[PDB]
Structures are given as C-alpha cells and as structure tokens.
Design a protein around this nucleic acid. Sequence first.
DNA 1: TGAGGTAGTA
DNA 2: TACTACCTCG
Length: 641
Amino acid sequence: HLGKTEVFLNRFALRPLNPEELRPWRLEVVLDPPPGREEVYPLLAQVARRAGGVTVRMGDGLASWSPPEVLVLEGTLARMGQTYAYRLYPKGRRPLDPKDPGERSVLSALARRLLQERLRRLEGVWVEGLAVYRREHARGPGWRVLGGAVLDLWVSDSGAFLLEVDPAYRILCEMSLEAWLAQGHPLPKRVRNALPGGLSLLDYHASKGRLQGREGGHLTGLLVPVLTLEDSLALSLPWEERRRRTREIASWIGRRLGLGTPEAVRAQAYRLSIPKLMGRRAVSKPADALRVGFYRAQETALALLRLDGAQGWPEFLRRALLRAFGASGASLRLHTLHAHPSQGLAFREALRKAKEEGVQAVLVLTPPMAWEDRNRLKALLLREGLPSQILNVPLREEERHRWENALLGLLAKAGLQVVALSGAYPAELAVGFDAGGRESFRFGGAACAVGGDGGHLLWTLPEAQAGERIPQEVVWDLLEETLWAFRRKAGRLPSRVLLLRDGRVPQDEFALALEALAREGIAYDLVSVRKSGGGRVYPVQGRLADGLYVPLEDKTFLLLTVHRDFRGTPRPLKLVHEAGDTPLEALAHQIFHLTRLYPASGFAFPRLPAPLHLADRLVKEVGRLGIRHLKEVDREKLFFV
DNA sequence: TGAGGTAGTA
DNA sequence: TACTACCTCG
Ligand SMILES: [Mn+2]
C-alpha cells in the first residue's frame, strides 16, 4: 500500500532432511483388545509416545525416524481405565513428499518429536515440553525466575528443518508450602502438589506413603505453591533485545542438537495506509472527540448515580461533557439519580422513571466495588434498559486518562458514535463472531460495525451453546440481525460483508450463512483471526513499524496492528482468508483500519479489529452477568465495554 | 471498577 | 479460555 519492505520471522531454517529422514519407517500397530472407535487414534498416538524414540502416528499406523530396534516394540499401556497390550511390526520404509502437505503434516510431527526427544538429553537446562530455560537472571525470597525460549521444529515444502524460537520465562517456587509459608510470604491462591470414610487425616496421609521424606504440615508440607502474579521485574522484552536472544538461542540449539546453522528467514512486508480517524473532524485518538466533537451525536440524556453519598456532577465532568456536546453540535441533558441500591425495589422504580424520561446511560461514582456487587448493580440497571459506566470515587481532576476513558465509555454506552473511519473499504458491514463466558457451556455472540465509515457499532443477543463451535443457524441468525440493522440505517442491503471469526473456524460453521448471503446477492469474505501462533516479526533493518501486512503462504498472512515500544514486543495476528474473492491486501487494509474504531479506549488502540474486540467483551459480560437482563437493552448501546 | 498491550499462571 | 502484575497514555 505504502512501502514494501522486508522482515524476519522468529523461524529459522536448519539442515535439510538426510536420507534416513525422507523415508520414515512404517510400523503396523496391534492392540489387545482392539480399541473403541472414539478412543483409537489418541490411544495409537499414546503407543507412539510409549515406544520411545522419535515416532508419530501416521494415519492408521506409525511413522518412525528411530530404527525399529531401538524402540519398545511390545509393551503395556494404561488409558483412563483400560489395559492394552501393544505390539509393533516394522513394515519397511514409506517415502514422504514435503510438497504433499498431507504428508508434510507427518514429517513436521516427526520433526517436533525430534526436537522434544533431543531436548530431553540436554544437561542440565530446564525442559518443559518444547520450552527450554537455560539461564537465571532473577531470584527472590523463596522463588526464582528462569529464562529461555519456547520452540518448535517442523518441515518446509522444500524439505528442510524450520525452527521457531521465542524468548520466555519460568516462575519456580523453590520451597515447600510448609517451608515457604515459614519464610514470611502471603497465601498463594493456587498450589500444585509435587475423615468421611475411616482413614483419618494423618493416618490416610502417612499410610499413603505421601510422608516419605518431607516435613509435617489438606496439608502444607505435602504441596507446593505455584507462584504467579502473587509473590516488579518486567518480563516483557523490547523487540530489539528479544530479537537478539532469539538469534542467540536459535544458534545455540541448532549447534548443541546437531541441527546445523540457522538462517533467520526473511519475508516480504508491506506498510499499510494510515487510517483516517474522525470525530466531528480529524482526530488522532478517540479521546480527542471530547474536544473536537463526536462523529454523530443526537440529543442525549445521561444520569449520575453517586454511591459514595455526595452531591451532583463534579464540575470537570460536567464541563468536559459540555465541551464535547457543544463541539458535536448536539444538546446535552444531565440528571442526578436520588436513589440507592439499599432502597430495594424503590431503586428499580427510580431507574424505571429515569429510563422513561429518556435517560440513555448512567455514570456510577463509587468506591471500588466487589465483583459480586458490581455485577448485581450492572445487571439491575440493565434490566431497566440502562447501561452503566463505573468510575471509582477517589478521583482528582488531574487523573485525566481515567475519567476521560470513563466518559468515552459512557458515551459509547449511551449509543453515540464517537469516532469513524473515512476511506474506501471493500466491505460496508463488518461483523465479528466469538464464543466465551465458558463453564459447563458457552455463549456464541456477534458484534458489528455498519456502514463503510464503521460509524455504527452494535451487538446482537448471544446464544447459549455446548462448546466453542457456534451452530450454523445461530451464525446465520446473528448475521441476519446485523444485516437487518444495516438496512435499518441505510435503507438497503450491504454490497459486501466482512465476516471475522475469533480463532480457527470449525468445519462448515459458516456454510449456511454463506449460502444465504450468496442467495441474497451479498458478497462476503470470511476471515479467521488467530491471536497467537503468528510468532514474532522483526525488521530486517531499521525501526519496527505499526500496520504491517506480511503475506505468508496463499490465503494466510500476518498483521501487525498495534505497537508501542514501552509495552514490549508486538505479537502479530495470524489471519486466514477462509472464503471470499477479495484480495488479501485489501482485507489486511480494512481489518487494520477497523482496529482504530474502538471508542471506549481513548489513548490506545486494541490489537483486534473493533467488531472482534466488542464480541469478546460482549460474550464475556453476558457469560458473567447472565443473558436474562438484555431484553430491554438497545443494540446501539455498547453496555459491555 | 480506565483503558490498552505484553508478560506470567492455570 | 479465563485471571493478575507492570507500563503508559497513538
Ligand atoms: Mn468499561
């Protein structure tokens, strides 16, 4: 779009596969008794993990880079309450082609096991899975921090080893929960180990043999505190230092594992166009809409609820709002609620009266509330159709970031459009889908930006579902609501929509929706947005920019949407064009620009495009509060930000 | 409950 | 997927 440059990925190309590696051994597996269908492939992979050596499951059999004579061919296996007796028959070598991706899967699996097994025999670094911690730079009062990197090893379509490296840290408590609590450290909110039925506490403990060595002390000397944020030292690295350590560790592991000499891979990068944020006029951040004016503001009524027991609006909030609305060319009406939650139903009555007099949202001035009470209050207001923005009461006028963000949140919750984009984009309706609020079940939800400008953010009623997969009919129904909204604002159907999915798109999840869209004459683009596994991106030379489009393979690409040096090293998004005919650069363009639409964050843009961020917040808040409160809440109002 | 990210933990 | 810590304010 702008300049096409160059980058490094945190992957490294090592030696190609020697002739022992291109033609892996084929092992036919025999179990006794023959398994059960749902439980076969995992059991088979378990067999591969039991024969030792570098072997993986190859379809209905096993593939091995290790000679069959240095594997435990015949063995016994326990699986969730069933004893299997396995035996492996070597059936020669089967040649695999890296160009064939289906077999490249197998080769890459073998590579991963290679990395694992070889990392096992490294003295004397700390090895957990494909991670390795090979130094210490931080200690503590009974806890130390190790420093290394998380790795991966796979094969390319060329047929050579590629090695992904990313600097990491490990938190290690070095004292038993007995000894640790004896040094003078507070109670850990979690603790990994190393009567109502006869056998007493001490008896059942010691007789279980769980007292052979350690002190007395559930127990105390029989567990270990898994320290987290509990017991500072920034574990975030500036991109430069991280890039360096990535190099160093790459070379080290390549050398100390007989994998060769690493060459940092270079990908072609493209600098994307600068988004045109707009309030009443051009802005650089949504917070500037409070001085410049709102993209679209009508006659609005906002109410105040003080729980700290005090007076009216603190003059700076009043004046800020007056500046914002005077600039937006709209009349403002501020109310004060003379009511309190301790009134019982009279409080809900107060809320009902407020709603009936046109109040669109309420600002809650209050000392730090507990999760319980905050939730109850939120939902209670919500049941009268009033979104609420909480602002903590120890609030001085100089804390401008906090209260300008609270104000922005308020305005966003009252149904105002605070910012918009001014450009040319392939889609004029962009909708994001996510599932969350998890537990025994999840909520599948959608949020949308309607119009080319994105000058309209809405949410749809989420739907309870068994897992992460959203039902096809639920997908099409939510999308239908987004469409219907678009037609309510534009008087027509959208020329083209952009479907964004948080995470990988399960098979045929969007089948129904895409068919419907196709019938109505609506062009679409389905894009899967994965927040991780995109690895890292570094400038081959020069400064690290913000707005990077890195087309990798076909239909997939990386996208660096946000970067600020002080926060650490940016993690690019991995995006897959799952369905559609729009060019990748155009989609990257639109998504990157959609990243700036989020109005509730006034001084920092989110990493995800606004509809996905909104969808995330939405399913979280719905899963947290409950869906039962949302019946009388307007969809133009972002109650969940 | 100010918001964002990058870091950590399950 | 959640949660907490620290940094800073496009
Ligand atoms: Mn908020």
